[PDB]
Amino acid sequence: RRRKLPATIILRALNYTTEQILDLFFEKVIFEIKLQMELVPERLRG
C-alpha cells in the first residue's frame, strides 16, 4: 500500500536485463540487408 513505482523496477531487482525483459514480454521481427525482410503470413493480419 506504499507509493507505486514502475513495474520493470522489480524485474531489474530480480537480476534481469532489458534484453531478457523484451524476450519474455515481446515477440521479435527480423530484418536483413537489398533491404530484405523475412515475412510470416500470420503476422500481417491487418
Next chain:
Amino acid sequence: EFDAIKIALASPDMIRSWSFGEVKKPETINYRTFKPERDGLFCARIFGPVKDYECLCGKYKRLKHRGVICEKCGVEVTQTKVRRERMGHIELASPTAHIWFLKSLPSRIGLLLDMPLRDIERVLYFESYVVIEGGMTNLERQQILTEEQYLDALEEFGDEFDAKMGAEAIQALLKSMDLEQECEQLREELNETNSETKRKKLTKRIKLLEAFVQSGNKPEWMILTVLPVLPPDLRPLVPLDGGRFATSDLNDLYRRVINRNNRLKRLLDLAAPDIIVRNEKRMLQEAVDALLDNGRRGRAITGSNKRPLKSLADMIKGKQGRFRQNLLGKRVDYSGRSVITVGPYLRLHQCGLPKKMALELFKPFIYGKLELRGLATTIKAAKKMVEREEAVVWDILDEVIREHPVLLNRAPTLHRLGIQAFEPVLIEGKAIQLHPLVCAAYNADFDGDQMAVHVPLTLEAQLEARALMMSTNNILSPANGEPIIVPSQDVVLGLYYMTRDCVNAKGEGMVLTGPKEAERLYRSGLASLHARVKVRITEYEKDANGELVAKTSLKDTTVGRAILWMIVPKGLPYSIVNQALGKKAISKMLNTCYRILGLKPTVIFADQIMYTGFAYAARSGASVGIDDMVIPEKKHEIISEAEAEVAEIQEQFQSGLVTAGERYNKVIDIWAAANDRVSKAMMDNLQTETVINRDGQEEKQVSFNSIYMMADSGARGSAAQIRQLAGMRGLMAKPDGSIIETPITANFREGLNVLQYFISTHGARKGLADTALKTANSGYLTRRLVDVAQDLVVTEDDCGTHEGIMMTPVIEGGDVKEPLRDRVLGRVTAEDVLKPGTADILVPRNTLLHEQWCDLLEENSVDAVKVRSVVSCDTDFGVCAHCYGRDLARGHIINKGEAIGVIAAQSIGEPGTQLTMRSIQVKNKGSIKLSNVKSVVNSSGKLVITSRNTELKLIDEFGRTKESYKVPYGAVLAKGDGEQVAGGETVANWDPHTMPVITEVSGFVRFTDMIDGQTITRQTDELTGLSSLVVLDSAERTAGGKDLRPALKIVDAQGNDVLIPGTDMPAQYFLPGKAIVQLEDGVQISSGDTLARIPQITGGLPRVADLFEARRPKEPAILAEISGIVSFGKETKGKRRLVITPVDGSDPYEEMIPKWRQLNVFEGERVERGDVISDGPEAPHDILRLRGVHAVTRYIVNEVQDVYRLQGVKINDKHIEVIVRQMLRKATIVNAGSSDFLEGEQVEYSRVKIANRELEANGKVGATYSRDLLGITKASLATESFISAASFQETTRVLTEAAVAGKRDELRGLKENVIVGRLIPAGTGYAYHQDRMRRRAA
C-alpha cells in the same frame, strides 16, 4: 443574574487570580492511607476538604469551626463540594506556546507576526535563531539565522545582537510589537498601493490588527507562562470494588507536565550542556500541547492501553463533548417507559397508565397529600405506608392523578406530534393503553413498540400540557391543515360495511319514520343492514347567520346509513353518510365537520365514529380464507400465448433478423402486456358478483368478497398486492438494476418453486438495506434545516408591506395538478382582487382567505391572486403574522412567539423516508391563446413561430387556462388566437430536428461571403444532386474565409439589397457553421422562407438536499446577462465571444461561451436580461441576479414540490418559503453611497436595510447592494453567537476565533438558551425575554 458571556485570552495575572495554590508534585494520594498528598494533583490545602466540615489531620471535625485553617495541615474546613470549583496553577520553567493559537490553520500567531508557520515552528523547536529588534547593526527584524550563521555573525558584532531561540523568542517578538504604529504604517501603505493583491493583503492585515486592538488582549498572552489546573472532582480518582481505582486521563497528562517541568527546573540548576536543556524544553512543549489538545500536531500519546489519552480539547469538542451531548440530550427524573396496547374504550384525551408505574412516578405528590390529610404523621411514615401499599394509598393516588396530564413520546420524534399530553386512567397490568386514533400521529403499531412517559411538575408545565400539547387540541397536521385523526383500518372496514347497499335483502322497500326505527328493525332481525328503504330524515343547515334551520324530507337510503346518521352532529348535510363511505369519504366528512361546526363537535364525532366502526366491524364477522383469492380461469392460456410469442421472437433472433438489444425489449414488452392482461382479468373476475333478485332476473353488483372489500374500502392493501395474491407475482429486477426478462408467473395462492423464491430474495434484502439509508439521510436534512432556520419567530403583527407572490394554478403541459384553492387558502392578500370584469374589489386587502373567500373566488373563476409572503417581509429580525398566514395546526392567524422555523424544518423533513430516488395535441376544448408570440403569414396563410419565448395556452370558455404548451421556435400553427379547437387537434407541427432558418419577406437571396470552397462547400445532394451548400466553421473553411462571415442578405428583383422588412438594417441572416443551405446560391425565396436548416434531473431525497444547498447544475444554462443586440467577435480563442450592445447603453458585455455549446440566438438578435442563450439546467444564483427575489423563490418551491407531489406527499408552501428566506439573508454592497460600508463586502440584509432607511430619513442617500443566495450550510455558519455556533460547528475553530476577537455573547437564540438552561425566547417564554429587554433599555 447574568445577561451575557464574554470570552477573551487570559493573562498570567488572571490565571494566578483564579488559582488557590500551586501544584508542585506529580503525587495524587498515599497508597496505604488513600489520603491526598501535600502538594499534588489531589491536594486538600489547595482544592479543599475531602469530607464536609472536617480538616485532614482531624482536629477540627464539627461545623462549629466552619471557616478556619487548621495549622497542622492548612485545610480550610468547609463543604467538600468546593472541591468541584477550585483551580490550581503550575509555574512553567520556560514559556510555552498555546497549540490552539499556534496551529489553527489561519495561525493567529503567524497572522499577527506576518511570519510563515514553518519559520515559527523552526524557531519553536530550537532549529534556528531569530532577530528581535536587531537595532542599527545591519540586522533585519524577524530574520531567520541558522546556528552556524548566528555563531559567525556574533563575531565582529560586540553589540547584544538581540537574537534568541525557542518560545521565549516568539514571546519577545510579540511583546516588542506595537499595533497602533503598524496600523498607521498599513494605512500609509494603502494610501498608495492601489494593486489588487497588495491592497487586499494590506486591508486584511489592518482589519486583523484593528480587531485585536479593540478586543483588549495583548499578543504576548498567546504564549503560556502559567498553566491552570482543573478542579479535582472533574478528574476524579474514584475507588472501585476490590481495591481497584478508576482515574481520568487528565491526571496522566498533568503528571507528565509536572514531571517534565520539575526535571527542567532541576536541570537548569546543574548547568547542563545546552543539548540537554534544549531537549528538555522540547519535551515540555510536547507535554503541554498533549494536555491542551492531544494528537493535533504530533502523532498521539497513549496510556496503559494503545488508545490515545483524552485531553481538555477532547472534552468539549466531538459528538460526545459537553458542547454537544449533555446540554440538550440528558437523562431525566419522573419518567419511565413501557409497552403499548390498544385500549379501544378510551376518549381522545385519555391514556391508560399502569397503577404500579404511577405509584412510582407520583411518589412525592402522594407523600405530600398523605401528610396533608393526617393519614401519615411524618414523611417516613408515608414512605412505609406507600411501601406496604395500603388501601388508602390507592385512593390518594386516584386523587392525585385526577387532572394531571402526562406526556407520552415514541422513539423517533420526527415532528411535534410525537409528544402529546393525555389524562391518565389507572389500570391493571404493565402496558400502556393508547387511543387508536392517535397511532397515525406517532406512526405506532402494537407489535412490540414502546413509549416513554414524563410527568409535568410545575403549574406552568401542567398548563402548557393542557393548553398546548393536549391531544384534543392537535387534530390537524402542522404540515397541511388536513385532519390527522382519521379512522385507520378496522373502523374503515366497519363503516364501509355498514353503509353499503345490496340488490335484494330483508325489508327492502320499507318506509321508516326515522333512524330509530331503522335501528329497531335491524337489531330485531327484521331488516338487513343493506336494505334499500325510504326514511324520513331531518337535517339542519346554517343557511343564515348561524341559525340551524331544519328540513325534513323522505330520503332514499339503506338501513345502515340511517343508523349511522344518529351520530352525525346537527349542522352537517345528509349526503355525507349517503354513500358507501370508504377511507377518504370519512376523512372528508371529518374535515367538513371541523370547518363548519368547530373543534369540540369534531372530537366527539371522531370518538363516535371509532366506536361505531369497531362495533359493526365486529358484527360483520369479516374474515380471510383461501377461497377468497380467486385466480383467473384464463391465466394459463395467457401465459401459454406469451410463451409462444417469446419463443417465436427468440427463434427469429437466432436467424439474425433482430439484434439482441431489440429482442430484449420485445420480450420485456410482451411480458408486460401479459401481466397487464392477467391483472385485468383477475380484477374483473373479483370485483363483481351476480345476485338474484327482486323479481327473479340476474343482476350484477359490487362483490362482497372479503379481499376485495378490504382493498376497495381502503382499510388495508391495494390492487398491487391483490395482484401478487391471485394474479402473477410479476416482473422482478436484478442486482445490476436490469429487469429479468422472464417474470415469476406464479402467485402466492399457488407456490413459488425454489428458483422463483431465490429470485425474490434479492429484492427483499435490497429493500431492507435501503430503508435504513433513507432514514439516515432524512435525519441529516432535518438537522441541517433546523440549524439554519431555528431562530425564526413571529415577532410582529403587521409590517405594512404591499408586495407579495402572485399565486396561479400550476399546470404541467396537460391538466392542472394543483388548483388555486390549495395554493391560496389561508394566506393574506397583498392587493385587491378585482372582479374578473374589472368592476370593483372582490376581497379588499389584508383579508385572510379562509374557506368562504376561496369558494367566492371559485365562483368568480379568478385564477391569479397576489398574496403576502414570508420571503418578502419588511420585519427586522423576525416575521409578521400577516406575511406568514395562518397556523395550519390551529386553523387561525398565527400568534406572536411562534417558532415557525422549527415547524417548517420538521414539516419538510418528516415526510422524507417515504421518498424514493427514482407536437401539441390540445386535449380539451377552448380558445387557444398565445403569449410572447412573433409571427408572419406563411405561403398558405398559416402562422410561423418567430419568438423564442412563445407560449400557447388552451384558455377555456370562462377565460381560465386549462393547458400550457411551450411553442418551439421556427414552427407553424394551424389555428390562431381566438380559434376554437377540439380533441387531438394538433394545433401545430415542427421538425423534431434541425432548427429552421426563416426570413420575413419574399425576395431573391445573394450568397454574399458565402463562397464555395472558401467559406462553404458544394455538398449538393450526391444522389438527387440538389444544391446543398454547407457553411464551413473557422477551421472547416479556408483561413481567408475563416475571418469572412457567411451572409445570405435578401435582395429584391430590382437588384437592390432588401433591408430586414420593417427595419433599416438589410435583411442579412448570417448562417452559422453546418447551416444546411439546400437553397441554390442567389435564388429568390418567399416570405419567412426556410433560408436554411441548421442541424439539430435526479429525484428523491438527494434532489431535495442539493436544492436547498444551492448547487450549480453541471451544464448551467446561459442567460442574457444584459438586454441588447447579440453579436460575436474574437472566435476560436478556445471560447467563442458574444456581445449584447445595449440599444443605447454601452458595455456590450463579452462572454466565453464554450464552443462545444449549442446557442439558441441568431448572431443578429435582440434579447432581454434573463433570456436563454444556450439551454439546460438553470442555476438558482443566475435566477436571483438577473431576475428578482420573487423569481428564485418561485423556482425553488416549484422545483422542490415536484419531488414531493410525485410521491403523494402534501406539505404547504409556507414551509419552503421560510427556509428560502433564511438562504437569501446576506447582501453584497455595490456602491458605498453615503452609508458606512465598503463596496466589496458582505453584510446582513436586515442590517443594511435599516442602516440606509434611517439614513434616508436624514439628509443622505442609501447604499446599493446585490442580494446573495447561500445553501442551508453556509447560511447556518453565519451565526453571531459563539455558544450557539460551538454546538454544531467545530468547537476548536469557534473558540479560538472568539477569544482573539474578545467576543461577547448575549443569549437571544433558541439553542444558546437551551444550553445555558433558561427559557427559550420563542413560546411561553417570549414575554419573559421582552420584559428583560425593556429593563435592559431602562
Next chain:
Amino acid sequence: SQLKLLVTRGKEQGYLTYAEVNDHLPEDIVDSDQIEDIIQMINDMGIQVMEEAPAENTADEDAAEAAAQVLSSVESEIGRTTDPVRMYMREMGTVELLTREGEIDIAKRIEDGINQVQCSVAEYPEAITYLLEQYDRVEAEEARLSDLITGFVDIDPELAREKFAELRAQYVVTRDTIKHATAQEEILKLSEVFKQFRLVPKQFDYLVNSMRVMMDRVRTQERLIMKLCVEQCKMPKKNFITLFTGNETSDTWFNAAIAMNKPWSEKLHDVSEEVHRALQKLQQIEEETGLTIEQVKDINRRMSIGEAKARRAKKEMVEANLRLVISIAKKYTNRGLQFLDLIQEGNIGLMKAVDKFEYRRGYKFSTYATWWIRQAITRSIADQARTIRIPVHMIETINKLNRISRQMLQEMGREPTPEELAERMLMPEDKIRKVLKIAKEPISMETPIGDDEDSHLGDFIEDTTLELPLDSATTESLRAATHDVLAGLTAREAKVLRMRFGIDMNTDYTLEEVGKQFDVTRERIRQIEAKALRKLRHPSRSEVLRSFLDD
C-alpha cells in the same frame, strides 16, 4: 505542482483515494508523521481519504488559503521533522566519539581547572578562621571528628589533631605579625600548610558561597556608587579610573573629588549621602578583606576561567556519553515511562558519573557510567511511573514475588498459592496478600464499554456522598417538629434546651455560660434541663418526635 495536481482531482470529484494521494505525493521522503501532517493539511480545505473510492462543505476560505500556502511550503521543504526523538538523534549525531587517550586530556584539564579554583579560594585565607572555629566546635563534641573533614593529604586522628595544632600555631604567629614586609610571606606559608588538608565538598562549597556573597555585596556597593555618580551626574569614566582605582579605600576619590570645579562634582552634592554610606560600607568590607580588591578581582577572574574550562571539558565528555544512555534506555522502553523521558533521566546519571570519575584507577568509563546510568533509569521508573507512587522497597518486593512466582509456576505447572509463595519466600503470608493487593494501575475511565449507546465506563460510576431528597425533607420536618414541642414550653427552659444542644444558634454552650446569662451555678440549670427532658419524654408531647426515631 504535484500537490496542486493532487488538489485538482480532490476538488473535481470532491474526494480522493489513499493510493492516488500517496502516489501524487511529492517524492519528498516523509517520515510517516510528515505524511500524517500533510493528510490533515489537505483535510484543511476538506477531502475524503477513503482507502476506497466513494457529506457537505463547511470550510472557511481563510482556512483554505492558509492550508494552500502551507501545502506549497511542504514541497519546497527539505527535512522538516515534527518528532522530538528524531530531532534528538540528529542533534546528537553531530559530535565525534573520544578514543582511550581522549579522556586523559579531558581529565587533566578538569584536574588543572579544579586545582586552580582550589588555590584561588586558598589565596583568600580569611575562611581559615571559620575552619578553625568549626574544628573547635566539633572538638566540643557538637559533631563527629570525621564528618567535618574527609581526612588530609597524607590516616589516624592523632595526626589530624597534630596538623590542626600546627595550623593554629601558624595562624596565631602570622595574624599577630602584620607589622607587612614579611607578613605576606607568613600568609603564603599559612596557605601552603593549609593546602595539605582536605575538606568535605559541602563545607568547601559553603565557604565559596560565603565568599561569593561578600564579593557580591562589595560589587553591589560599587555599582550603586557608579549609578549614583554616572547616571545622575554624568561623571566621566576617566575620572573614576584615575581616582577610584589605585587606592580604592579612602574617600579621596569621591569626597575630595567634589572640589574639581566640574558640573558633575557639584551635582554630587545631592547624592553625597548615599555614596558616603556606600563608601563607609566598603571601607569596613575592604578592612574585612584586608586585601587589595584588585588582587581579589584577579582571583575571581582566575577562578572563573578555571571553572569555565572545567565546565566545557566535561561538556564534551558528556556529549560523547549522551552518544551513550540511548542504548541502556532502549532496554526499558515498555516499562511504563516514555523513551525520551528514560533518555533524559539517564543523561543526569551520566553527568553524575563524569564528575565522580577518577581516571587514575584506569576504569573504563564506559563502565564507571553504564552503572550510574542504569541506577538513574531504574530509580525513575520506580519514583514516577505509577499514578499512585510506591516506595522503592515495595517495588523491589513486588518484582521479587513476580519472579519467585514464575519459577514456581514453571516447576509446578500451576500458579502458586499465597501459602506456597509465603513458604518459598521469607514472608508471614499475610504480608504476601497485602503486597498482592497493592492495586495495579488505575483503569481508564474512558475505556469503551459500549455496542449500544457508545457509553464509557466512567458514566456508570455513581456519587455516594449525596443526600437523598427524602432525607432533606425529613431533616426540615424535624427542624420544625422540634420548634413545636419546644415552643410548647416556657421561655427560660426552652432557651436552656436551645443553648445546651445548639438548636437555632452556632455553639453547644456548656452549662457555665448558660448560668452566666441565667445567673446560677450549674446544678440548678442542670435541674431546669432535666425537668424539660423528662417532660418532653411523656406521651402527649412526643409522638411525632418519636416517629422521627427510625425503628
